[PDB]
Design a protein around this ligand. Structure first.
Ligand SMILES: CNC(=O)c1cc(Br)cc([N+](=O)[O-])c1N[C@@H]1CCCC[C@@H]1NC(=O)c1cncc2ccccc12
Ligand SMILES: CNC(=O)c1cc(Br)cc([N+](=O)[O-])c1N[C@@H]1CCCC[C@@H]1NC(=O)c1cncc2ccccc12
Lengths: 304, 304
């Protein structure tokens, strides 16, 4: 029993972190097979940060303009045999294939999904935590200067899903990054300019999962027989800054084990959005959308 | 910037997890050099879980009663060449030394301290999170059946401090375990009998660290010129379920860089235990004691 912010064990990914240095700019990079991914603004000379010409910056570069160093495990310098650009990322071809490359994927997560983040500095991991892709395509992490290139991932089975590479802090505690296809979440730009965010919203499915968690941990004062259809809640959501609810088989698993219908918790959410009246839900006085249905499933009933 | 619950990268400790089997019971064990630490109640069947004779169960034991097996990376069975009991733990000697043994120590943590927990099942790591040793000598983790033997740790430099081995769940979301000297935190007993806990308290030093974090994120509406001595706050604390405050340099480093005195934040705590006046502090309506001064230093200023 118990619900915490839980991240995936990071050894798989610790073995893939390196330091990327270009000119006078250093950051972190992900070393998979014969490739090292890193943010492309490592090439930007710090003063072209307001109007960077990444095409010109790339053609300007040679393969020795980049230095890749591995500080964890067995250290080595890796000779860079190729440099390429993909969206907002640099893909550097190296002469040695990473012997610790795990089975991996590059799939872009949508808002509401969760992934474990491994924060790194100078190619050295410092901490790990779990975040959620906000509806405005940001995350609420903890990053200092030089942490870009740190990677966010999940793992189902033996396969690691690499979904995030840190790039920018927009406001206090607000951050963004890339998918490993090169596209930046929310179409933000890698340039120190004015960047407006969309409005943040509560992730409906995650609140439902969190209420199911509270029930399975002996906290169910908020449950009454009343119900509210999914259409009834999505229309309510379009006016009160909530995401459109979409049922999934994990949410349905939670509903089956609690004997509490999704519609009951949607009604409960409608009632709790005003205020908890001084009561607590799993030690919280607000609705919590930091927990996905899969996360609660694995934490409460386990994936054996 | 930003403050999250951050855990230490776990590869160090993942490389030390094994499965320990004694009869029909299977839990996790920590493999350091030629020794495997595990909870001793792996020896006791449901038959004697209400009044166990651990002294006799050990003299009853042979080296063939125990099976140690390694599931991650390269699987293997390890022969048990010796069995011993130390407090509430079993030390089983094996013929093979763990080749990935890191530099480690065994220290018993005090209330208010935080450590990273690696949750394991059948010797396989599943998740990692951060907990705090509560004033009643429990932790608020996430453990299901088979979680025993999972370990909580910290890291200084190259040295891992092993502080916790999980053993029991007392109530929903409430857990405890033993230190690697063999003693169980809070003197709980490894017998499936009802054990009432002492009263939980707010850990004052950690709330002070969290307020310092808030100030350093441009959030300091709660700061008044008013002061409250540590002696007034401790007298107030013993009557309002707070721990008695004790300063450290870590708090003092925070105090000088914020230009805000500890006593000011103690006054703020006295005022905030009532209610936050509809305000938010780093996005919550509760006081947060999950963050230690060292944690705040490392996350905000990078002083580890
Ligand atoms: C205004 N801070 C922005 O991060 C930023 C904003 C915009 Br708008 C555009 C970019 N951009 O173009 O990459 C930004 N990144 C900076 C530019 C060059 C390379 C990376 C830089 N950022 C960090 O080093 C960094 C990462 N995480 C947390 C931090 C906390 C404090 C200080 C720095 C960071
Ligand atoms: C549930 N009850 C107790 O855990 C318990 C309670 C007391 Br009082 C004493 C012991 N004791 O003496 O070991 C206990 N451990 C059980 C006894 C035999 C071996 C381990 C057993 N526990 C787990 O498997 C376990 C661990 N963590 C979280 C869990 C969540 C749900 C279910 C089980 C767990």
């Amino acid at each position: 029993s118990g619900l915490v912010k839980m991240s995936h064990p990071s050894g798989d990914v610790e073995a893939c972190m390196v330091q990327v240095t270009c000119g006078s700019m250093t950051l972190n990079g992900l070393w998979l097979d014969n490739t090292v991914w890193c943010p492309r603004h490592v090439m930007c000379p710090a003063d072209q940060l307001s109007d960077p010409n990444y095409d010109a910056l790339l053609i300007s570069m040679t393969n020795h303009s980049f230095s890749v160093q591995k500080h964890i495990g067995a250290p080595a310098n890796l000779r860079v045999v190729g440099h390429a650009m993909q969206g907002t990322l640099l893909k550097l071809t190296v002469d040695v294939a990473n012997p610790s490359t795990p089975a991996y994927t590059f799939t872009t997560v949508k808002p509401g999904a969760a992934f474990s983040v491994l924060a790194c500095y100078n190619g050295r991991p410092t901490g790990t935590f779990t975040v959620v892709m906000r509806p405005n395509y940001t995350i609420k992490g903890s990053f200092l200067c030089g942490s870009c290139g740190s990677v966010g991932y999940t793992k189902e089975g033996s396969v690691i899903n690499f979904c995030y590479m840190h790039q920018m802090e927009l406001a206090n505690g607000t951050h963004t990054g890339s998918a490993f296809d090169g596209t930046m979440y929310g179409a933000f730009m890698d340039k120190q300019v004015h960047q407006v965010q969309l409005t943040d919203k509560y992730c409906s499915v995650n609140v439902v999962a969190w209420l199911y968690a509270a029930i399975l941990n002996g906290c169910a004062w908020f449950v009454k027989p009343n119900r509210t259809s999914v259409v009834s809640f999505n229309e309510w959501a379009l006016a009160n800054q909530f995401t459109e609810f979409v049922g999934t088989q994990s949410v349905d698993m939670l509903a089956v084990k609690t004997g509490v219908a999704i519609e009951q918790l949607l009604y409960a959410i409608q009632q709790l959005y005003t205020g908890f009246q001084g009561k607590q839900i799993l030690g919280s006085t607000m609705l919590e959308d930091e927990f996905t249905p899969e996360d609660v499933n694995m934490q409460i009933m386990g994936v054996v």
